[PDB]
Amino acid sequence: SRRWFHPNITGVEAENLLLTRGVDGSFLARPSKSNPGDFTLSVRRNGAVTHIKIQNTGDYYDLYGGEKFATLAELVQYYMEHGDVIELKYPLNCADPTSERWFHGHLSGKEAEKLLTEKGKHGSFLVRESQSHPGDFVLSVRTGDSKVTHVMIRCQELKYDVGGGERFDSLTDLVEHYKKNPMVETLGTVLQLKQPLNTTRINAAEIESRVRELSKGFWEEFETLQQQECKLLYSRKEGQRQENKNKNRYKNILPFDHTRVVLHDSDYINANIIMPKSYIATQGCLQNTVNDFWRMVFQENSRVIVMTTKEVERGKSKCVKYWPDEYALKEYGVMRVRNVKESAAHDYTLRELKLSKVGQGNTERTVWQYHFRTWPDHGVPSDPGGVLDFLEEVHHKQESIMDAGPVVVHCSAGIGRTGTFIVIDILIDIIREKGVDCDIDVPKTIQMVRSQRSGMVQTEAQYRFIYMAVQHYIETL
Numbered sequence: 001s002r003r004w005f006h007p008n009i010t011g012v013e014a015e016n017l018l019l020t021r022g023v024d025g026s027f028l029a030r031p032s033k034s035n036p037g038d039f040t041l042s043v044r045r046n047g048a049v050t051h052i053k054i055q056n057t058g059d060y061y062d063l064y065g066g067e068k069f070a071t072l073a074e075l076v077q078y079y080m081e082h083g084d085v086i087e088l089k090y091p092l093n094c095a096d097p098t099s100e101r102w103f104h105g106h107l108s109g110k111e112a113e114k115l116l117t118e119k120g121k122h123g124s125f126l127v128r129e130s131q132s133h134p135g136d137f138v139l140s141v142r143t144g145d146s147k148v149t150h151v152m153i154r155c156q157e158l159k160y161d162v163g164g165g166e167r168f169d170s171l172t173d174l175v176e177h178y179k180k181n182p183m184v185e186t187l188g189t190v191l192q193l194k195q196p197l198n199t200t201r202i203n204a205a206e207i208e209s210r211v212r213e214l215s216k217g218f219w220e221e222f223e224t225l226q227q228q229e230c231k232l233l234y235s236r237k238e239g240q241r242q243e244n245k246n247k248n249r250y251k252n253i254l255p256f257d258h259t260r261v262v263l264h265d266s267d268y269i270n271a272n273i274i275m276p277k278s279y280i281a282t283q284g285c286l287q288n289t290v291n292d293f294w295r296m297v298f299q300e301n302s303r304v305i306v307m308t309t310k311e312v313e314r315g316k317s318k319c320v321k322y323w324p325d326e327y328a329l330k331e332y333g334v335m336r337v338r339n340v341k342e343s344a345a346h347d348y349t350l351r352e353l354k355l356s357k358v359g360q361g362n363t364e365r366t367v368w369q370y371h372f373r374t375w376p377d378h379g380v381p382s383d384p385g386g387v388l389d390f391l392e393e394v395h396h397k398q399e400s401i402m403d404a405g406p407v408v409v410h411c412s413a414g415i416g417r418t419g420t421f422i423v424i425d426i427l428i429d430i431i432r433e434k435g436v437d438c439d440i441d442v443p444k445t446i447q448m449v450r451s452q453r454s455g456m457v458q459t460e461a462q463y464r465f466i467y468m469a470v471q472h473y474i475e476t477l
């Protein structure tokens with residue numbers, strides 16, 4: 001559901017809501033007003049409201065006095081199923097419809113009809129503020145293969161209704177009810193609420209116009225996408241096994257069982273297959289996971305590794321050195337690696353590595369390691385040029401290699417900068433194959449990658465970087 005997230009609420013409003021409408025164990029999560037980019041977990045315990053900081057600079061959701069999580073929905077689920085104790089028992093539900101995909105706010109019946117004509121199909125819908133009745137709403141549906149129907153939504157004592165029957169405490173409750181139990185028109189027409197009207201899918205050539213519309217917008221679009229993360233709470237059982245605990249960099253940032261990379265000749269690595277050319281999104285190696293990392297690269301026939309972290313950042317180990325020094329030969333378990341040559345560029349270093357299995361002459365292949373070294377400690381690069389140029393080179397290397405396996409992409413936890421690189425690369429690959437005249441949907445593409453690994457793309461800063469990267473790529477064409 002993800003109803004416990006309140007997007008437009010202050011700390012005082014949150015305390016008031018938990019005191020007057022909540023009980024002990026009641027909680028909500030919201031964006032931090034005193035430091036944008038951060039979040040606050042507001043909890044009621046023994047008659048009083050406490051506020052707990054969640055930070056995210058781009059790698060994970062770091063909860064004060066708690067753990068590091070891939071998403072807020074994953075954090076909430078962990079504490080619900082599990083300096084004294086704070087109990088998360090009861091979500092305080094938000095009635096605000098702003099982050100709902102179908103909510104459009106200020107829109108006319110003429111304009112809603114135009115948008116439903118252009119992008120709509122049978123069962124496409126939206127909810128907008130009423131023109132004639134200020135404070136009321138309008139549900140606009142498309143039916144057929146075709147027509148558009150407008151259903152008036154009355155707001156009477158902050159409860160919503162369609163003229164009769166049930167009175168709902170929020171537009172969400174009304175939308176959910178009439179989605180399960182569709183309204184039938186007198187003459188037979190079933191007003192099916194199949195899917196919300198798409199607004200994010202744009203033609204590639206027109207990216208500059210949307211970036212301008214969102215630069216006035218980016219925050220609202222991202223948060224609508226974040227609201228959809230509750231649909232991606234897939235099982236991560238293999239990652240929770242006792243034998244696999246110390247193979248994870250962050251205890252609760254785990255690979256989905258259905259997409260994890262299974263090792264066949266144990267079977268565990270914290271990595272997932274990303275299918276849009278495919279990728280392996282993984283974490284930075286631990287001392288005890290270097291061998292399994294090389295077994296993964298060898299088994300998957302990967303010929304290209306993208307590393308988007310320094311070994312050490314802010315005096316903390318982000319990835320152990322899994323490759324030999326230049327000209328040196330090392331043995332990592334059954335795997336053998338030679339670092340043939342290192343090439344230094346402005347933003348990155350290329351390492352030409354020869355990988356083979358010990359005792360097997362013929363299994364040798366070149367593995368090209370692209371190590372981006374200039375990504376800032378916090379946030380995203382100011383300009384996308386460097387990232388795009390690095391990515392163009394990586395794409396060309398992979399393209400030149402006959403039957404190359406997935407491209408391996410890693411940072412620290414392997415969800416933020418990793419998620420960001422993979423998404424930019426997916427969107428650009430669409431534009432190089434189709435041209436300026438093609439459709440691109442940034443939130444749709446992210447949602448698709450997020451169903452394959454938790455919290456792929458962590459922040460609004462990264463979200464805006466993906467848009468700026470795409471815009472830059474289209475501009476230099």
Ligand SMILES: Nc1nc2ccc(Sc3cccc(Cl)c3Cl)nc2[nH]1
Pocket residue numbers: 100101102103198199200220221222224225228441443444447
């Ligand atoms: N109005 C409006 N703004 C939005 C911002 C983000 C999203 S998320 C999304 C977008 C496309 C496809 C899929 Cl599958 C998803 Cl989940 N939907 C929105 N609708």
